[PDB]
Write a protein that binds this ligand. Sequence first.
Ligand SMILES: CCCCCCCC/C=C/CCCCCCCC(=O)OC[C@H](O)CO
Ligand SMILES: CCCCCCCC/C=C/CCCCCCCC(=O)OC[C@H](O)CO
Ligand SMILES: CCCCCCCC/C=C/CCCCCCCC(=O)OC[C@H](O)CO
Lengths: 406, 406, 406
Amino acid sequence: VLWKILWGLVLGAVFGLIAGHFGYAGAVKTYIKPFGDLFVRLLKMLVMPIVLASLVVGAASISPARLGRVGVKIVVYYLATSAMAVFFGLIVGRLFNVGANVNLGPSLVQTLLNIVPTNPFASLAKGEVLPVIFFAIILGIAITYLMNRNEERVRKSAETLLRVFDGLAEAMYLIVGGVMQYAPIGVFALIAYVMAEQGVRVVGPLAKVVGAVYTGLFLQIVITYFILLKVFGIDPIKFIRKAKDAMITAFVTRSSSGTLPVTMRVAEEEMGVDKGIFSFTLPLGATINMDGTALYQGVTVLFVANAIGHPLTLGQQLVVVLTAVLASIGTAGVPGAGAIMLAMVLQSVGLDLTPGSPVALAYAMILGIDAILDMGRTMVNVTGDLAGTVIVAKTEKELDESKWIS
Amino acid sequence: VLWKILWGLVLGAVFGLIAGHFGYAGAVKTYIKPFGDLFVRLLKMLVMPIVLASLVVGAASISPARLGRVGVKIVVYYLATSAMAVFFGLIVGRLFNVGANVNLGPSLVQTLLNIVPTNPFASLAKGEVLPVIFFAIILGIAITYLMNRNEERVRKSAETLLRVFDGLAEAMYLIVGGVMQYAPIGVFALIAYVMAEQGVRVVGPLAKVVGAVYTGLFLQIVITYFILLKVFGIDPIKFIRKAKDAMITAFVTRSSSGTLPVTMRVAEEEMGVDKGIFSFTLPLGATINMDGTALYQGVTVLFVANAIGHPLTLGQQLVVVLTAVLASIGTAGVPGAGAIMLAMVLQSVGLDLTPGSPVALAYAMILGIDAILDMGRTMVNVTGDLAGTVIVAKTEKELDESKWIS
Amino acid sequence: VLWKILWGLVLGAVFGLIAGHFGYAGAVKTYIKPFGDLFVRLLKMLVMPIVLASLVVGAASISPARLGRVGVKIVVYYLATSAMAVFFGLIVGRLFNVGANVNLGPSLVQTLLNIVPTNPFASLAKGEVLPVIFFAIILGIAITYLMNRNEERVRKSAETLLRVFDGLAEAMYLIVGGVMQYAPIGVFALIAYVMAEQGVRVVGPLAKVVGAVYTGLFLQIVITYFILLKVFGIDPIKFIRKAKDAMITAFVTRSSSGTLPVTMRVAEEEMGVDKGIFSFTLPLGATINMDGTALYQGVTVLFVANAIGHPLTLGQQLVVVLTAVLASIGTAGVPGAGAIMLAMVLQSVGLDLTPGSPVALAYAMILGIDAILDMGRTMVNVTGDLAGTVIVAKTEKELDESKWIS
Ligand SMILES: CCCCCCCC/C=C/CCCCCCCC(=O)OC[C@H](O)CO
Ligand SMILES: CCCCCCCC/C=C/CCCCCCCC(=O)OC[C@H](O)CO
Ligand SMILES: CCCCCCCC/C=C/CCCCCCCC(=O)OC[C@H](O)CO
């Protein structure tokens, strides 16, 4: 069973390219794509149950103090890694010199308030991850306070509620395992459709864009995550071997949230992270991780700027990327995200997006490879989420070391 | 208490006809109808709790293999009965020669993917039955797998979750029983309003339409269901006696889903079907049963075709009905359904529905008796659902025979 | 810790007036207001969990007969107090002679049906209090019926479900306590923003309107509630001392529903009311209490009538207020409510609300102090809710007397 998913990925990508190159991507859309859509839905089904129950259990299992420390540690991690992602975006974008073709040429306060759900049942029904995180944490904390109270009735009620959440989480993890028996087929179908539709379009300048973007992701992995793991004494090759199922699922599904059941099962079975850490850190990182955004914006912004011949200094590119990143924070992984955010960035600087204009043209070109860019963006984000979770668990002594030894 | 509902039905229907015939149906709308609306809402309240909890419990109570066999058996049953419904629709429509008045004259793939909920809390809040069925089944299965695991903590969590669902289901069935103390009043009020508004309109050609339609339903009952029950060794007269509360409730409420709490209580208390069978088969059949649709479309399509003098061969009528049935699958029982589907069918063949046209006129005439047709459609559908559930339970040895013996 | 909230209120109100008087209310909107919005959201988070679980537990704890008696007692109470509120509205409005400036110059049946939820999960997700009350009551009743049944499996399932709801309620009350450690800051921020924006606008005629309105509220408290408490043998000064946290929270949040977790914790910890009483009476009173509405409409209607010089007899004012009250019943406490209802009342009598008209002008003037009027409206409503809850609990012998004795 082991390694079957990576075969699924490679075979799907080859089939997709061949089918697209020979004209048949339309038939693929009809016949192949539904198996991958099914894989994606099966994983989505589990997100709210597993996230709620796992975080209620985790926040019960852990002291408020330690939970606060885990929060601050993981946020510092995500800041570090997003800073690196901005750097590598600027660097690799300029090295590849993307866009050598020729044309003519603050609301964050309410986002924080919105962290607190006004109706937790509504946030569950609407699939809002961050407020569910908040309610689960507060419920877990309250539950442990009640379970230390003297009156036995209170203790027994709290234990029953906690067991209901524990049972739900357990059932979800089991279902994830079952779905992961299916995962290779889904991965094949998704990468096949993407390759058949947009792979053939990666050529000429856009190939250098895709290469540039993927180079940036590669560096973010092999430099930032590996060095951070080594500094804290984790073998990065063992890490990758254990992360592989989460990484490939992130790649193909293009959703940090949709991979969560898989990422959490990998953190439990493979990484050996305690639920008190990953049940909190992973859903949070799925919504706050800004590495892929910084990389996408840096590269695609440079490509666009060069396509219309607008001069852009390194500092000006940096300020633009940073303001785009600030506008992006809090948004979870969703397909077609960075393209929309890029369109917003272009609009806000006063550029003419009316049909026929050069900028509308460069944007459409990016938009047509956007799926190819999103796969890598999501894969590097989920990778960084697992890395930071493992690191924090280690610093909190919640990492099981036996899993990391051949 | 027993048989009180059937008195409610007959008395309500008489009162409704008299009130309508004498002009007073408007007063009925004001004063009488709310008691029936209340009955309908009280039953609706129970659908999601009882369906979720009953199916979680049932799928826990039964092995995956047996559950698969129950699924395939009940689907084969619904195919058989829909084929018969098409036949009887064509036959009875032509025998009555409906419409002797004179005027001038594929997206199923996404429906299957949509079977899988992406947010089960969302599907519960939105009242989507089929995805709730899916999640409950998978949860039940997962729960039983965990309850056979060695670790006691896992077993105890799973048992607590399963008991929560069992308690909810039990509470729902008790509430159903209480509501069924009220049922005769609700049945009276509903049939009274319907008779007062549209009963008086069943005369002349439309009476032959109503007669024709009701004849088709009658045959579907007394031929298809009775013969199928006898082949498998169930007394059909005992069956009807036990089904009577579900049949009348289906008749008056015009909703397969809204009758579900009653249909399930009848299957438990009267039919003696195990929850492992009916908690699955009945909610599924409420959304996939196509007998009433085939009958409605066959008759009303023939009536319309004759009204505008458009020649329609038996094979052409069959192909039209079949494509309407394919378009209808997956839609649960809802008032005003077949009228909309008929309107779609008329539009798709290129007919002119603009005001004043002959087809708009014939459609309005059907629309005005549509409630009268819907009552029968829903009653025959719920009857067929109970019949197929009982049959499958028998073939699985999950039917308690002591209930069927005087 | 005790009395800290009342300091928060007074200090916030002073800061707000000074900031507004000196121009800086805009900065307040940016910097100060979010802390109060956070307080409001933190309380809102708890409404559905605590209301559901508390009412399931309460209706389990109490017999159906006693629950019916509690219902009828509390409704009679709310009728009495709304009649008094109408009286005091007319009286105080006329005494202050509001509006001495000079210009040119039934659907209740469906509301009752809507009490019954058609999908209780939907009503939880949508935050509909009254249908959640209904489902919780019926669930509690059903649960106690099952727990008296002979079969132990049924008893154990019902007990598990009831314990899940009890644990949730307990966790909510604990969280409320924690939030109430924070309450003074929130109260400060809210009253500060309101004073800075609209306090400065209370001058001249509008000051007499505000005074008039607040006088009416004062009377409703010191006459109706005090006399009713004394008749039944409750010390009204002890009552106020115990109610103070609920009263101030109601004042600042301007939401009966949003204060519910606080009102219920006050009823439990301070008043000593059994959950069987207050878990039902308080959420119901939050949606049906009509005292503030009668007062608001009486005063603002008189002010408007005098501003445009339209002659209004005392009986005509009474009929208008009564029809507005009938239109208002069932609506829970929400900011900006009475202004909308007043606008409806003005429209329905045929007045010209087109821009520039005198009535549009008087309405805009009320609208600009509407927040100042809403604070008092909500505070008097929550006060009356606690008073009636305590009274009913006493008549049912569910009030703990030890809490009322120094
Ligand atoms: C996203 C950045 C991090 C967000 C926040 C951290 C993560 C979530 C909350 C954890 C508990 C934090 C509060 C409880 C722990 C603080 C210390 C404690 O134990 O009690 C505090 C109390 O107010 C006096 O001791
Ligand atoms: C609507 C038509 C029917 C829909 C489908 C049936 C009803 C619902 C599912 C039942 C369990 C089906 C899967 C589990 C049972 C299959 C055999 C089994 O026990 O295990 C399968 C496993 O993959 C190797 O053994
Ligand atoms: C808002 C005005 C009040 C609304 C209604 C009251 C409050 C909610 C319901 C309580 C139980 C009422 C029904 C159960 C109690 C009635 C007597 C009883 O115990 O049983 C009734 C049974 O039908 C023959 O005995």
